[PDB]
């Protein structure tokens, strides 16, 4: 679980790319651990207004880091305010 | 398989280009290890904004790195996107 990144330099995202897209990491000393078997969650803040939120959030989402990020997650999910 | 030369210190780039001209490299113990048997491969999407596309690619491409780091290389291969 990543909390709040649209906080994080996008070097750390770059990290996470391959992490994404194979499912393997390798650190120094050449361990390369299997991110194959776990679950990733990211965080982040950055009737049909519900949906034009969406597709404007989407398009900060674009703008704020690279496509080829985005190609490599699942699920972009927008969560909707809480309504009372 | 070197993926995403992009997005690398363009510092790193010295090691590959000793390694491409003459195909070895130095460790610290001293070994010269030898990668003139070696099929090599680096993979990275800089033009992605967009035959005129090879043009601007390579454009952006020489803008992207030494000129000393792209005259050692076999085979510039620019992908082209895909359709229906």
Do not use: W, Y
Request: aromatic share 6%; net charge negative.
């Amino acid at each position: 679980l990543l909390d709040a990144i649209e906080k994080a330099h996008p070097d750390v995202f770059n990290i996470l790319l391959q992490v994404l897209e194979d499912g393997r990491l390798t650190d120094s000393k050449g361990r390369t651990v299997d991110f194959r078997n776990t679950i990733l969650i990211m965080t982040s803040n950055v009737t049909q207004n519900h949906k034009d939120m969406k597709d404007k959030v989407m398009g900060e989402l674009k703008r704020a880091f690279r496509p080829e990020f985005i190609n490599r997650i699942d699920e972009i999910i927008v969560f909707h305010s809480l309504e009372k | 398989l070197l993926d995403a030369i992009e997005k690398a210190h363009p510092d790193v780039f010295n090691i590959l280009l000793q390694v491409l001209e003459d195909g070895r490299l130095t460790d610290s113990k001293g070994r010269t290890v030898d990668f003139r048997n070696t099929i090599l491969i680096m993979t990275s999407n800089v033009g992605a904004s967009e035959k005129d596309m090879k043009d601007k690619v390579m454009g952006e491409l020489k803008r992207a790195f030494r000129p000393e780091f792209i005259n050692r290389i076999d085979e510039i291969i620019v992908f082209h996107s895909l359709e229906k």
